Every structure is written in structure tokens, then in C-alpha cells.
């Protein structure tokens, strides 16, 4: 039995590359054998059956004469190994040795071209790309809060949300770093800064409208045991591998269309019948309008440089590659335990995590600076190895996107609002807001933003009233 | 006659003209030193020397003396470094072109302890454009003025400390126009750290306004650093309004802050000696304490955060990517941007060196929006690295640190002054809250909180501020 690269080159006969691809090879054989023997999912639920079928899948691979075709690009995977050997030291920050996981994924197929499993398989065998699960934190926000709210037509690109101080149900303040919050802001600013309260209100709105949020997340392969959590949009109650989470940003980057992640393409018996072949099941999870609007937002998350120095780092390493159409989002857990940076061009998504195996804190700036700088170095290694793999294509608004002229101040169409009895003529600076519904944005009404108390609205309307 | 590098290697021999940047700059300055020495030797008075045909005669005589004579001219120019600077601009200059044309450039590397100029960049390519953008060009230093003319003086005079609050509330010039910053009429109260990081304008306006109300001799300070500003009675002076400088002079103001407040006059010539042994000129060390050590070291701490905040420069990010270990040196700096983005400045120091940097167009037209935020910052990280590669210890590993004379005060985040009770317009109030350490350069430290706790701000501003404070 043999395991090969995408081109056919032998990886090995039956150091992360071996164990990862063999393991997935095995899971594939497992499904196949259980299918071959008509084991129902009840018996499959059973633990000693599980052990038996696992063992049988493994021997079937050793004893069989199987050709196992992987999706791994040798040059690219190899360059990624070198990148982490050469530049992994950039992660270490005086909190101990910082572990890393990266998965490089073709956005149009979901194939995985290469990955980084950890700083050094010899030193530490944990596989941080495929096995370790950590809260994805704020990188949850585009997928589960904002993207869904837009796809449902509850929100456009320049909609306003409350970042006024507010409490969880226990009465503790919702915090972001040191801040209890500020006031109204646009989706764009909420996203660039990664504020927490606007995300809380958004998911709260989705529950109020009874939106099938599980539907969305499950179509991307996400398994979240409990959706009834106030901090869910922030990453609370969620734990994901780098591979699975990469698959989510693949969905946004591929114009809303999911392709299931995979590292095994084909398994052929000695006589050459396919025991397993990868079967494309493209799923439209977000509308093309919603995914393309989200792309324009996530472009500016990087551009703005508020929570990541990535675009600066990359410019200094390779100004040409800095000009590809990068979009992305960062994540940071509450005690700086885990940092994420997810990056896409139209062709590829590169998911990246860092943290400690025992879950203890990183440095304040581990995500903003170190992982950003390490990931720029990695992206540049992938380029050198395979020089047009990223592409210079641009993300663009889908024709079905609807434009609205809204007031900058309310994110809604200008007109008459009643403000404590005195009805007023809301006028002023306007912007183009992008929506994914039919009618675009509504007329401005008193409760114009996502979230906010009465005290907040009093206060906010006061400022707008300074006409 | 020969001009050499600091180590004695010959840059060039000087011959009469028939009828790069490095040659003409050093020659032009050698000539200025010979001018001084000839007027001297002939006892011409500096009033006699205001006679204009007399400038001409003594300038021509100084040119001739060098041409004819057998003079050894020792410059301060470090050959490997200067050479690395010329390669860096040739290799990375293109990073400055942003779509508005051929972006010109001036850089001056200075030793903070002596004022010696180790190297410079005169421009993009002497053979295409001979204008010397390091020594000749004068442009507004824009916001890079603020630490020198506004905040550093106010701290020095005891009128403000590291965590003093200043107004950024909307305010007008005397002519009724709003003071603008980018596109913003302003915000509210903010710390000195925030005013400096974002480079707001209203806090500098109020700072200079204070200095003027106090009768502070701002001119005294600036002139001790060699700055020539014809009119100090300008509202926007602390933003760079009514100031034009060369990169060499302006690098010298930053050298003064970096050197714990002690100015050394910039120079490119260290010695002229004749074949017979006469030393016709030798650089005389003349250190001047322009700001106190407490002020300069306080200012150093704030300028460290200007760069690390990355608000108006990507520099520390660019440099981290090029050379992480070099990025860990103790960098401090300030950016400048003129109103229409005509001119971008970035000034950088470690304890050992100051590197000034300007970009812009010879004809003064606009650069792109991010020319200084990103392009200059990235080109200068490349320059700082090339200097490093040429001379790996030259930037040094020393840290900037508070002088012992600095006075520390425990102060309210919200007011910048000691906690206590305040006349909040009938209803005496007890001000409590978040505490921070504030550094002062005086004897006594910060005040107890007064009603008017900030630099600047109207009656209505203070109603607004105090209302929001009290809400605890
Ligand atoms: B975001 O990563 O910028 C901020 N996220 C959080 O604060 C978050 C992360 C994990 C669990 C819960 C929360 Cl609120
Ligand atoms: B600073 O460069 O960030 C802001 N400075 C200016 O706005 C300025 C520049 C030159 C002349 C006058 C002004 Cl206000
Ligand atoms: Cl590997
Ligand atoms: Cl391959
Ligand atoms: Cl809580
Ligand atoms: Cl749900
Ligand atoms: Cl999952
Ligand atoms: Cl639920
Ligand atoms: Cl697979
Ligand atoms: Cl950018
Ligand atoms: Cl609709
Ligand atoms: Cl030169
Ligand atoms: Cl004066
Ligand atoms: Cl001057
Ligand atoms: Cl005056
Ligand atoms: Cl000189
Ligand atoms: Cl002689
Ligand atoms: Cl830093
Ligand atoms: Cl940056
Ligand atoms: Cl005190
Ligand atoms: Na984040
Ligand atoms: Na500036």
C-alpha cells in the first residue's frame, strides 16, 4: 500500500504528513468497511464495534495493495514545512514555546494543498492543524452573526449597531479588552475593531427572528452542541480544528459556496476499483450577494490594520504579493490563550492558529503582531514554491447585490422620524449600503440600529439632532 | 586638496572647474568652514561681513584656497554606511512611487552624541535629478514639529506631564474656520499619549497657546537647536504652519530629544588641515542643554509609543518583518503630514542614532493618502536594515530610560491631576476613579485636579466633560 501526492509521487508505503494522510486514509477505509458490512449507525454508535472497525481499517491498509491519492502539493507542503522551521521562532514571545497550526485550502474544491501541524513533529507530536480544537473567538463573527444577518436581509454593509455598554443576563458587563463599550457604529467599524457587543446584539436578533443558525453552521460541517449561549457569536461554546475552520472561510471566499474539506482524493484496490473517491457536493450556504458583501468587509479588516499587522508585514516581504486581493479576520480568546488569523484570496484560504498545548496565556500582541508576521512569511514561502497559486484575481460584488443610499448616521434611508413626539426630518451625509435582500435598506426609524436600550437611543438621537 | 571619509579614505580630489551628492555637500561645507577661517585670519568684523560684495570676495577666496591649496578635508561620512544608504535608495526607492509621479526623498543619519552626519540620501538618483533633498530642500515639518515646539516645551516649563489631558473638542482659528485634522472637526478630552499617537491638531494649538499666554521663550528653545522661524505669532505654528526646514536641520532637533535633551550641532566636516600642518578648522564640541534630562526622557517614552501604537506609521511592523531583532532595538519617532499630503516626514531614533526622512515632489503636488503611513515607513525600514547590515552594532542595544530627576505623580486617568474634591459649580464633588502614574519635569509634580483640568477647552466643553466624568 502506497500514499501519494496530488501528482502521483509517493509519499510513503504502509513527519506529520505521513500520520495525517494515513489517519484520514484510515477513516475513509473505516466508512467504506462499515458500509461494506451494512453496520447501522446504532451499532456504529457502539464503542467495541468502533475499536474493531478502526483496527480492521488499519490492517486493510497495511495488508491491502491500496493506492491512496492525497490532495497534498509536494512543493507547497514542503515549502510550508521549511517556512515553519525557518520562521516558527517568530511566534515565541516569552510565554514558553508557542505551537502553531495552518491549513492551505483550494477555495473552489475544498482540497487541502498543504498544512503545518506544529513547530516540530520530533519535539511534540500533537497535530494542531487537524486534531487540536480551540475556540475560534472573533473569527466566529463573520460566519455566525454578521454573514447570517445579511443573508436574512436584517442587515446591510453600512448598517448601524450598538456598542453601548450592556450586560449579559447574569448582569456582568459584556467586555472587549478593557472596554465596557462606546456607542453606535457601522458594521465595518464593528468588524475592523472586533467589538463584542455588536455581535451579541446581532445573534440576539437572529434568535428573535427565529433564524435557523444551526442550518447555516451545519452545512459547513460545524458541530456546536449548544446554540443557546449569549457569547456564541464571540466564539464562546465553540471549539474547532484549524482544518474545519478553514472550511468556513473557504465558504465565504468561494462566493458563498461550500466544498467539503478533504486530504484524500482516491483509494484504489490492487485490481484498481475505487474503494473511495472524493465526491463534490457544492452547497450554497450564503447567497452570492451575502458572501461578496462579506468579502468587501473582510478586505478592510485587513486593510485597516486595527487587529493585525499582516498587510504591513507582507508589503515589506513581497510588495507584489501584498497586492493580491487579501481578505481576512482575526480572533483572540479572552485571556489571550488562542490567536487566529484567517486569510483568503479568490483562489485559496489559509487558516492559522497559535497557542499553548496546555491552554495558558500568550503575550498581549501574539496575535496582532507575531502570528501576523509569521503568516506573512508563510504566505511568501507558498508563493516562492508555486508562484501563481494565490492568483491576482479580485473579489467583487455579485450583480444581485442591492445598493441603497442611506444616511451615514443611521445606516437607513433618509426621511421623517418621530423623536419624542417632535417628528423630525432626518437629513445629512449619505453612503452606499450594500444589501442581500430585494428592497435594499428601510427608511430610517427611531430604532435604527442593531441593539440599544432606550437610554442609548435617547443619547444617540441627541447627537444626530445636532443636525 | 582631498576630501576623505571619517577613516581617511579619499572620496575625491578637488580640482578647478573647466569653464555625487557626496562630493558637492562635503565640498560646499568645507568651503563654508574655509570662508569662516579666512574672514577670521583677516579680522573682518561680522558687521563688515554683512557687506554683500564682501560675502562674494570671501566666498570666492574660500573656493580658490581649496582648489589651489594642499588641504586635507576630513568628513564625518562613514563609507560603508553611506554606501549602504545609496544602495538602499537605488534598490528600494521604487517603494515610494505611489502613482503620483517620481517621489523624491531625503534622509540624514546622525550620531546622537556628537551631531556628526554618518550618511545621507540626497534623492532618488543624482544623474536624473541633482536637487539635494537632504541638505537644500526646505518643506514644512508638519506634525513632527509638535514634540519640539509644543509638548516638549510645555513639559520642560512644568506646564504639563506625561498623562496630562488636553482638549480635542472642535475649535476655530481666530478667523472662524474650524481647526481640522484629516476630516475631523475634533473629539473630546484625551491624554498626551493619545494626542501624540494619532497626531491630532487641536491639542497642539492649545499647547502653543498656553505657552504664549505664559510668556515662554519658545524662540529661545528653537534657536538653540539652529531653527530659523521668521514669525512665531502664528496659530498653526505647532502643526508646522510657517516653518520650513531641511532634513539635516530637522534631524538635529530630534537628535536633541534623543540625546537626553543635549544638542550637538550637525556637521559633515570634522577637520581641515594644510600640507604644512596648519589646522584651519576643527569641529569644536559645544553641547547645549536645550530641554532638561527629565523632559527629554519623558518625551522619549511618549515617542516610543507613537511608533509601537502604529497609528500613523506601519514602520515597526515593516521592520519586524525585515529584521525582527533590529525591530527590538529601542525605537522612538514621530510622523508628519502636510495638509494636502504634499510632504511626509518620518523621524526615528535609537539612543545612539537619529534618522530623519522626508518624501514629496519637487513641484509640491500631492502624494497619495498613505504615502507616509505606509510607503515611507516601509522604505525607511528597508533603509534602517541596510544601515544595520553594513554596520551591525551601529544602532546600538541601549534603551531609553527615565532620568532619576523625573518626578512621578499618581493621577486620575480622567483628569490628569491628583484625585480630590472640585468646585463643580455649586455641589462640591469628590473626584475618585481609575489611577495612573504621570511623569513631570518640575519640582512638585502634577496639581490637585482643578475645574479646568486640561490644556484648552471651552466652557461648554468642560460642562460636557465634567458631566460625563461625574457619571460614576
Ligand atoms: B474577538 O476574538 O476579537 C473577541 N472575542 C472574545 O471576547 C471571545 C472569545 C472566545 C470566547 C468568548 C469571547 Cl466573548
Ligand atoms: B500632522 O502632520 O499629523 C498634522 N499637521 C497639519 O495639519 C499641518 C501641517 C503643515 C502646516 C499646517 C498644518 Cl495644520
Ligand atoms: Cl509534515
Ligand atoms: Cl504534487
Ligand atoms: Cl459573565
Ligand atoms: Cl439555531
Ligand atoms: Cl466543528
Ligand atoms: Cl437553541
Ligand atoms: Cl479526507
Ligand atoms: Cl492595503
Ligand atoms: Cl426584501
Ligand atoms: Cl552620494
Ligand atoms: Cl517666542
Ligand atoms: Cl531652520
Ligand atoms: Cl512673537
Ligand atoms: Cl560641516
Ligand atoms: Cl601648506
Ligand atoms: Cl513594538
Ligand atoms: Cl501595521
Ligand atoms: Cl503622587
Ligand atoms: Na481579534
Ligand atoms: Na502624521
TrEMBL record, chain A:
GO (cellular component) term, any one: outer membrane-bounded periplasmic space
GO terms of molecular function: acyltransferase activity; metal ion binding; penicillin binding; peptidoglycan glycosyltransferase activity; serine-type D-Ala-D-Ala carboxypeptidase activity
GO process terms (BP): cell wall organization; peptidoglycan biosynthetic process; proteolysis; regulation of cell shape
Keyword Zinc-finger: no
Reactions it catalyzes: [GlcNAc-(1->4)-Mur2Ac(oyl-L-Ala-gamma-D-Glu-L-Lys-D-Ala-D-Ala)](n)-di-trans,octa-cis-undecaprenyl diphosphate + beta-D-GlcNAc-(1->4)-Mur2Ac(oyl-L-Ala-gamma-D-Glu-L-Lys-D-Ala-D-Ala)-di-trans,octa-cis-undecaprenyl diphosphate = [GlcNAc-(1->4)-Mur2Ac(oyl-L-Ala-gamma-D-Glu-L-Lys-D-Ala-D-Ala)](n+1)-di-trans,octa-cis-undecaprenyl diphosphate + di-trans,octa-cis-undecaprenyl diphosphate + H(+); Preferential cleavage: (Ac)2-L-Lys-D-Ala-|-D-Ala. Also transpeptidation of peptidyl-alanyl moieties that are N-acyl substituents of D-alanine
Catalytic EC class: transferase
UniProt keywords, alphabetically: Acyltransferase, Carboxypeptidase, Cell membrane, Cell shape, Cell wall biogenesis/degradation, Glycosyltransferase, Hydrolase, Membrane, Metal-binding, Multifunctional enzyme, Peptidoglycan synthesis, Protease, Transferase, Transmembrane, Transmembrane helix
Segments forming domain Penicillin-binding protein transpeptidase: 103-335
Known EC number: 2.3.2.-, 2.4.1.129
Cell membrane among keywords: yes
Source organism, top-level taxon: Bacteria
Binding locations of Mg(2+): 221, 223
Protein's name according to its UniProt entry: Penicillin-binding protein 1b
Phylogenetic placement of the source organism: Bacteria, Bacillati, Bacillota, Bacilli, Lactobacillales
Full-sequence portion shown in this chain: 106 to 789 of 821
Amino acid at each position: 500500500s502506497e500514499i501519494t501526492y496530488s501528482d502521483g509521487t509517493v509519499i510513503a508505503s504502509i513527519d506529520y504528513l505521513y500520520f495525517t494522510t494515513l489517519a484520514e486514509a484510515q477513516e475513509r477505509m473505516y466508512d467504506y468497511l462499515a458500509q461494506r458490512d451494512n453496520v447501522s449507525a446504532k451499532e456504529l454508535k457502539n464503542e467495541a464495534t468502533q475499536k474493531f472497525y478502526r483496527d480492521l481499517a488499519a490492517k486493510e491498509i497495511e495488508n491491502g495493495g491500496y493506492k491512496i491519492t492525497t490532495t497534498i502539493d509536494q512543493k507547497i507542503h514542503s515549502a510550508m514545512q521549511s517556512a515553519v522551521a525557518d520562521y516558527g521562532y517568530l511566534l515565541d514571545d516569552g510565554t514558553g514555546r508557542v505551537e502553531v497550526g495552518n491549513v492551505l485550502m483550494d477555495n473552489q474544491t475544498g482540497a487541502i494543498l498543504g498544512f503545518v501541524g506544529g513547530r516540530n513533529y520530533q519535539e511534540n507530536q500533537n497535530n494542531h492543524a487537524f486534531d487540536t480544537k480551540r475556540s475560534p473567538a472573533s473569527t466566529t463573527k463573520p460566519l455566525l452573526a454578521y454573514g447570517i444577518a445579511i443573508d436574512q436581509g436584517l442587515m446591510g454593509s453600512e448598517t448601524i449597531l450598538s456598542n453601548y455598554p450592556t450586560n449579559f443576563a447574569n448582569g456582568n458587563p459584556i467586555m472587549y479588552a478593557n472596554s465596557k463599550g462606546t456607542g453606535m457604529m457601522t458594521l465595518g467599524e464593528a468588524l475592523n475593531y472586533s467589538w463584542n457587543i455588536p455581535a451579541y446584539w446581532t445573534y440576539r436578533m437572529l434568535r428573535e427572528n427565529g433564524v435557523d443558525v444551526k442550518g447555516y453552521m451545519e452545512k459547513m460541517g460545524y458541530e456546536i452542541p449548544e446554540y443557546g449561549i449569549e457569547s456564541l457569536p464571540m466564539g464562546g461554546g465553540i471549539e474547532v480544528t484549524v482544518a474545519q475552520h478553514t472550511n468556513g472561510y473557504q465558504t465565504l471566499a468561494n462566493n458563498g459556496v461550500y466544498h467539503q474539506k478533504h486530504v484524500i482524493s482516491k483509494i484504489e484496490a490492487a485490481d484498481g476499483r475505487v474503494v473511495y473517491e472524493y465526491q463534490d457536493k457544492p452547497v450554497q450556504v450564503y447567497s452570492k450577494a451575502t458572501a461578496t458583501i462579506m468579502q468587501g468587509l473582510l478586505r478592510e479588516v485587513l486593510s485597516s490594520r486595527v487587529t493585525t499587522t499582516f498587510k504591513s508585514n507582507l508589503t515589506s516581504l513581497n510588495p507584489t504579493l501584498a497586492n493580491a486581493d487579501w481578505i481576512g479576520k482575526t480572533g483572540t480568546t479572552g485571556q489571550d490563550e488562542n490567536m487566529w488569523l484567517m486569510l483568503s484570496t479568490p483562489r485559496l484560504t489559509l487558516g492559522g492558529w497559535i497557542g499553548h498545548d496546555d491552554n495558558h496565556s500568550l503575550s498581549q500582541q501574539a496575535g496582532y503582531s507575531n502570528n501576523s508576521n509569521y503568516m506573512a512569511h508563510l504566505v511568501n514561502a507558498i508563493q516562492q514554491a508555486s508562484p501563481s497559486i494565490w492568483g491576482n484575481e479580485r473579489f467583487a460584488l455579485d450583480p444581485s447585490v442591492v445598493k441603497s443610499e442611506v444616511l451615514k448616521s443611521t445606516g437607513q434611508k433618509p426621511g421623517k422620524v418621530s423623536v419624542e413626539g417632535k417628528e423630525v426630518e432626518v437629513t445629512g451625509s449619505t453612503v452606499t449600503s450594500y444589501w442581500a435582500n430585494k428592497s435594499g435598506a428601510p427608511a430610517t426609524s427611531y430604532r435604527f440600529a442593531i441593539g440599544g436600550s432606550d437610554a442609548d437611543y435617547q443619547n444617540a438621537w441627541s447627537s444626530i439632532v445636532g443636525s
